[model samples]
Target chain A: DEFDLLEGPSEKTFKQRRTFEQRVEDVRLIREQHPTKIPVIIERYKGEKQLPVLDKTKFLVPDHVNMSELIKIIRRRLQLNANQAFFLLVNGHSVSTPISEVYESEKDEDGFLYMVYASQETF
Target chain B: DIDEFDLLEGPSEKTFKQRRTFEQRVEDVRLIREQHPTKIPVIIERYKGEKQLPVLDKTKFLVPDHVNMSELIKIIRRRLQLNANQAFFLLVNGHSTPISEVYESEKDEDGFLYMVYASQETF
Candidate 1:
């Protein structure tokens, strides 16, 4: 039950709690306040078996952030080893393109670029 | 059986790799580079440990030096007609070496940059 502390609204993703209109408006306010940062939602895939839950799902990244930098941040946050297998998926595609380009194409209608991180698929 | 038969008597680009001598391959890269000064010669193959992903229709790629690994993966996925949801990862120098490093540092002695791709469990 160590994961019990992570339950309730915390268990739900940001999208589950906020409506589409609210989320879109949320991004507008976010951009107005911090023009250079991007709002990102990185979640652990439900099918993931080895990766642990990220305590925080919402992140505000810079527009110029590199994929390597982003992956490094996530790996450090997870305390993952260098040899441990890690994959980041955008719409389930393994993404390594310029983060800015990825943001332009993959950002949700809600204005958050959604991503899923996993170690490997479940057996 | 047809695919296996084709492999045995293949007119594929990969066959050229085995058929040509190292010196000829090196000279081939020099001539191609002379013509397309902006392009990087790349040889992409399936990861040796991979079993799920099929061999690419072609192995030799001419990519712009400015294009990062992510952009290249996008091109390869489209070339294979893989949907956005399929899981594909690229490796250079035995790992997912980031751009510039992979472009300049990992180029083979024969002048072509070498890469491998593998599929993870698709979501």
Candidate 2:
């Protein structure tokens, strides 16, 4: 109920009634404020089986992306089974720990990040 | 009735012991260090009265920024001539962190990486 006060059809929702066009313009403003994408390279280390090559060696992702999100993306793209365990590394260190903090410091000079992935079986 | 045919005279599996000469270990460390980037200051601390080099128990070390965690462990192992079965449990902020990751992401406000060393016996 507290959150609905700002977004709901309440007297405090807005100073004045907004027209349909006005609402559309507000969405455009918010979209323009969206976070920009950062470039990253994902390299495959030796693994139990070969993974499907990505469409491109480089990809752009939202700067706030998390490691789990990236893992899901890889699994989806490679058709990996859910039970399979893998590891992600940056600068040869496992990024399984807080990845956001790691990415903030380790990003390259060109605003790019490098990542390595391998199957846990090898370890 | 099948006891005679059980092949008791033959062993299906064999075990082998492998060892590397001291010279080989030295050469490996040299090769690894050669691949490292420039050296930087790193601070390490021991917890729960864990044993380490008396001089390095709570002190700083100049180490290559890109050194592997395994290599760092080997260096520390050699420094104290620790028992072959003993090992270190490295952590950052009370959580197990990869040695390389802590060097970059978990560095202190003063720009020095911090690590806590505990004996594997604790586990």
Candidate 3:
């Protein structure tokens, strides 16, 4: 590979890497394919130093689920223990609001719901 | 109420806002933050619309900036002496933070972090 001075898109979050039009098309097609699921992208917080990156960043969430249940899924995916700290943020606000509720109110113009996860110091 | 569980049985009730004036709370938040610059002052109560979960007699907490919400929930569960299968949720501004979230970025503009807990199957 040629030596390059510029950083690549791979280092950026999904929202950062894709344009609004591209994200909109991706969300539209994903939704069209899975009407009952909410399209989601979960990223590790940039400043986070503790948690490992998720192997999978994209998720299709069922509309019937709530945030508490969704956190459980992420915890399981991360293999977090009972004592570990974790939080999910949507548009800079960490929420326990229902996934459907958050989707409707906080979804981007592109129709995707972006989330960030972090694990830092704890009690 | 005669018994603590009775707190959970009644219709949703009053919160700390009813116990003290907002001005007093704001002043308290300022003082606390001044004393502990990196800590967050949090108030956790039962949701007003909640029909199941009990209210916490103690609402105030001083949390380290880096602590995770999941670990905090563990402490709360210990206080409640919850059953293994019982569902308990902690939320801020009606949205639940991911268990891994740190307190530093989540505090309110007033220098306090607010949370509510409810258990009824939904998040």
TM-score of each: 0.44, 0.32, 0.44
For candidate 1, write residues B1-123 as lDDT tens digits. Answer: 655644366453444457567897788788776665445777777776677777777667776543556667877887778877778988777675223346666888898787888895221
- Considering the two chains of model 3, state its CAPRI-style docking category: incorrect
Task: Candidate 1: give its CA RMSD in angstroms.
Answer: 18.3
Kindly list the per-residue Cα lDDT of model 2 for residues B1-123, writing each as its tens digit.
Answer: 965666457543211111334364344334433443234345455564555533343244656433455667666665656777775666666765223355555765544455666775343
Residue-by-residue lDDT tens digits, candidate 2, A1-123: 000000111111111334546645543454366435545667565332334333344566675677777788877765667775666677776623344465578865434467777765234
Quality of model 1 by C-alpha lDDT: 0.71
Give the alpha carbon lDDT tens digit for every residue of A21-110 in model 3.
Answer: 998999989889988899998987777655645666778999888998898999998777898788888887763466878899999888
Which residue pairs clash in candidate 2?
Answer: none
Candidate 1 clashing pairs? A96-B70
| Interface RMSD, Å, model 2 | 23.5
User: Interface RMSD for each candidate model?
Assistant: 22.5, 23.5, 19.1
Order of candidate numbers by TM-score, starting with the best: 3, 1, 2
